[PDB]
A paper describes a structure:
The structures of TgMORN1(7–15) and both P21 and C2 crystal forms of TbMORN1(7–15) were subsequently determined to 2.90, 2.35 and 2.53 Å resolution, respectively, with the PfMORN1(7–15) structure used as a search model for the molecular replacement. The two subunits in the TbMORN1(7–15) C2 crystal form and the TgMORN1(7–15) dimer make a rather straight assembly, while in the P21 form they display a bend of about 30°, leading to a rod-shaped particle appearance. TbMORN1(7–15) formed an extended antiparallel dimer in both crystal lattices, while TgMORN1(7–15) adopted this architecture in one crystal form. In comparison to the TbMORN1(7–15) C2 crystal form, the extended TgMORN1(7–15) structure has an approximately 1.5-times smaller dimer interface (601 Å2), which is contributed by residues from MORN repeats 13–15 only. This is closer in size to the 747 Å2 interface of the P21 crystal form of TbMORN1(7–15). The final C-terminal part of the protein seems to be flexible and does not engage in the stabilisation of the dimer. In comparison to TbMORN1(7–15), the dimer interface of TgMORN1(7–15) is not built around aromatic stacking but instead employs hydrophobic interactions between Phe350 and neighbouring small hydrophobic residues, such as Leu335 and Leu327. In contrast to TbMORN1(7–15), where the dimerisation interface is centred around aromatic stacking, a hydrophobic core plays a crucial role in the dimer interface of extended TgMORN1(7–15). The dimer is stabilised by a single salt bridge formed between the Asp308 of one subunit and the His333 of the other subunit. SAXS analysis of TbMORN1(7–15) and TgMORN1(7–15) indicated an extended dimer in solution and the crystal structures could be docked into the calculated molecular envelopes without difficulty.
High-resolution crystal structures and biophysical analyses of a truncated form of the TbMORN1 protein and its homologues from the parasites Toxoplasma gondii (TgMORN1) and Plasmodium falciparum (PfMORN1) enabled, for the first time, a structure-based definition of the MORN repeat. All three structures are antiparallel dimers joined via their C-termini, and, when possessed of the correct key residues, can adopt extended or V-shaped quaternary structures. The crystal structures confirmed that each 23-amino acid MORN repeat is composed of a β-hairpin followed by a 6-residue loop that connects to the next MORN repeat. The structural studies presented here make a case that one conserved function of MORN repeats is in homotypic interactions and possibly also in higher-order assembly.
Residue numbers in the entry:
A (entry chain AAA): 147 to 355
B (entry chain BBB): 147 to 353
Write the structure that this text describes.
């Protein structure tokens, strides 16, 4: 059995009001035309809680959704979906700050991982797409083009293990086709890579300069 | 206008004797059966001078030939040809010490260059053939097989310029075919070289 305690206008809930839904979990805050509208808080049966701005019975504008588990989103909503600027903390400790579209990461975004890794760059369909920089915990670093959370196209990868930066084509997160490899010495290699293994050397200069 | 002044036996020059030849240039020393034989010296018209051992009218045994120019050979002769152990100084300043055959370098020999370079190894037909070590003035060094004064077959070459060492096949004084290349880092490369350019990579590692 559902129930309400608040302000009535015309024949509908309007103004401040607290509402208990048939399923466990309540709402307290602002109402317009019998819909949740304005600043209010919802406590869900599943233990999740939203407090922030509503419009036409949905989360719209700035709001904070904290989950039963660590997960917490602080940012903007449009029609009950995460939309625009937003910061999401994952249970893991990983954090995304940046641009959301239709409950997916889309645009400029920085994801700082709990393992010390961090990526900043362009996102599309909730995955890295376009330019970006991944800096690995170990000291390895990528800078260049991404396709579907994979290093794809022209990129520069540095390997902390042996120095030796690579400049060239990437395919499916591995270096493929023409490229250049500088080692810490000043030794450079030009040629072709096949699935991350060097096949052919075009040039083999030194020129430390 | 020939002439002689020395010892006669039977009907020929025999014992000590000095001889002036038709062309300018003389001989003074030992004679047998009217031939230069034993210890004696010849001063040639061309300005060359030999002093050493003779047999049957030719240089045979140990002798010293000093030339019109700086060139000087100290070693063994057989029938007027440089033969066996010998040391030759060139006008250049270069020195060869070692084994000669029929007036050509043949066997074990060390050539010390005036530019600081040095080769030691096996010679044939007056050129490096078989094993040997060339050490370059700059610090570069080769050790392995030679064919006709060229690095040919299995060899190890070190390049002082980039402190890298290569182990593999050489063809015509350049690295060709399968080989391994270690760099100063610890990075090693396996694969095939063509002329002196890497074509194909088998392995690539860091140590």
């Amino acid at each position: 059995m559902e129930k309400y305690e608040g302000d009535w206008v015309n024949g509908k809930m309007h103004g401040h009001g607290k509402y208990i839904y048939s399923d466990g979990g309540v709402y307290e805050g602002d109402w317009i035309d019998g819909k949740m509208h304005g600043k209010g808080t919802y406590v869900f049966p599943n233990g999740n809680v939203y407090e922030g701005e509503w419009a036409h019975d949905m989360k719209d504008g700035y709001g904070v959704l904290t989950y039963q588990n660590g997960e917490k989103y602080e940012g903007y909503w449009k029609q009950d979906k995460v939309h625009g600027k937003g910061t999401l903390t994952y249970t893991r400790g990983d954090k995304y700050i940046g641009d959301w579209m239709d409950a997916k990461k889309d645009g400029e975004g920085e994801l700082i991982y709990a393992n010390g890794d961090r990526f900043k760059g362009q996102w599309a369909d909730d995955r890295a797409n376009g330019f970006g920089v991944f800096t690995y915990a170990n000291g390895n670093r990528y800078e260049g083009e991404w396709t579907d959370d994979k290093r794809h196209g022209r990129g520069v990868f540095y390997c902390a293990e042996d120095g030796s930066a690579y400049e060239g084509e990437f395919v499916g997160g591995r270096k493929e086709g023409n490229g250049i490899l500088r080692l810490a010495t000043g030794h450079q290699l030009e040629g072709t890579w096949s699935g991350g293994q060097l096949v052919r050397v075009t040039s083999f200069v030194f020129a430390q300069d």
